[PDB]
Design a binder for this molecule. Structure first.
Ligand SMILES: *[C@@H]1O[C@H](CO)[C@@H](O)[C@H](O)[C@H]1NC(C)=O
Lengths: 53, 52
């Protein structure tokens, strides 16, 4: 499916009809809303790591 | 001492015994590179300045 349809959050259903049980199985999958910007820190290795070698 | 002995000088020691010494014996050592040396040949290396 296209991306903006998933970002919009429309409900999607899968129809499961297996042989022994004629009753279909229905489920709902949607993307919840709620956005904080991550802060990335890249820690250098400790000087003891440079000591061990 | 002979001059060739001072060249590539060996350790010459002055050992004196007296009542007033702490261990009753003291020692002083001189050679070419200690007593009034012409040059101070030293090699100074530092490694792992970062430390731990
Ligand atoms: C002076 O020191 C350097 C480096 O340690 C050494 O290569 C050289 O042989 C030394 N010379 C004398 C006369 O001790």
């Amino acid at each position: 499916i296209c991306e903006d349809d998933w970002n919009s959050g429309e409900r999607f259903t899968c129809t499961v009809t297996h042989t022994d049980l004629p009753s279909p199985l229905k489920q709902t999958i949607s993307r919840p809303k709620g956005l904080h910007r991550p802060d990335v820190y890249l820690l250098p290795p400790a000087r003891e790591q440079l000591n061990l070698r | 001492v002979s001059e060739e002995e001072w060249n590539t000088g060996e350790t010459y020691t002055c050992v004196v015994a007296h009542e007033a010494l702490p261990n009753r014996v003291t020692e002083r050592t001189v050679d070419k590179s200690t007593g009034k040396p012409t040059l101070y040949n030293v090699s100074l290396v530092m490694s792992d300045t970062a430390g731990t």
